[PDB]
Symmetry: C2
Subunit: 142 residues, 2 copies
């Protein structure tokens, strides 16, 4: 069974690894932003949007991963060395959520296509050597 | 940030724990049920329903979870400590996803309210004294 988290939103995992791995904020920063910009819709009893639905599942999923990695770090080894279980999650999967978290928060703010366009525009822009690219990078707004 | 997976769907975490711990299939059974019944709608570029989108995340999330919980099985040694993660997985989250997976597969199959009513009814039935309850439990079948 093969599911692209983005296919239903008009994008893919190809399109997101299209941006450099350091382009995205941290997972901790992206969650802080979710609360700060949307908590009431996110805690609301309404669907609101497919982006809202997806965002809530993605926030909570990182919750299911972190909770599991912390309870499993505590039960054999030192709280100073047990951060290999939480280290592990930020190496394999931590990058994946960084893309996914950002993608939806961004889509809520500016509009799905805006973010889609922004990804292709900013993507070809970052690859372009300094001398060949405009001084004004693509910008993300309404 | 404090979010109920079910609130937007007319349910709550209280409401699903209304049901016994053993009533739900394994996760492994639920995903194979899902694959076999829905692979094509779930793999579609279409939302279909809020249930579909929430489901896709959850199926995919269980993928990310097993990847983590198995990697710590690799880093273990004791025959009682390797079995420390799949003790938790069968207790804390495996139960959570079993409910969540089940809630959604079912809603797609039978209808949101259908699945909801069934939860109250089966819930009150299991709580109901044997001798006071009908022999025939509330039923989950194709409307």
């Amino acid at each position: 069974m093969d599911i692209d988290p983005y296919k239903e939103f008009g994008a893919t995992v190809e399109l997101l690894s299209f941006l450099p791995s350091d382009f995205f904020p941290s997972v901790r920063d992206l969650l802080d932003t979710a609360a700060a910009l949307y908590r009431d819709a996110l805690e609301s009893p309404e669907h609101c949007s497919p982006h809202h639905t997806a965002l809530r599942q993605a926030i909570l999923c990182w919750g299911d991963l972190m909770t599991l990695a912390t309870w499993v770090g505590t039960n054999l080894e030192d709280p100073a060395s047990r951060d290999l279980v939480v280290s592990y999650v930020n190496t394999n999967v931590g990058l994946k959520f960084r893309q996914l978290l950002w993608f939806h928060i961004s889509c809520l703010t500016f509009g799905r296509e805006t973010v889609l366009e922004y990804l292709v525009s900013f993507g070809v822009w970052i690859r372009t050597p300094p001398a060949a690219r405009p001084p004004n990078a693509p910008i993300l707004s309404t």
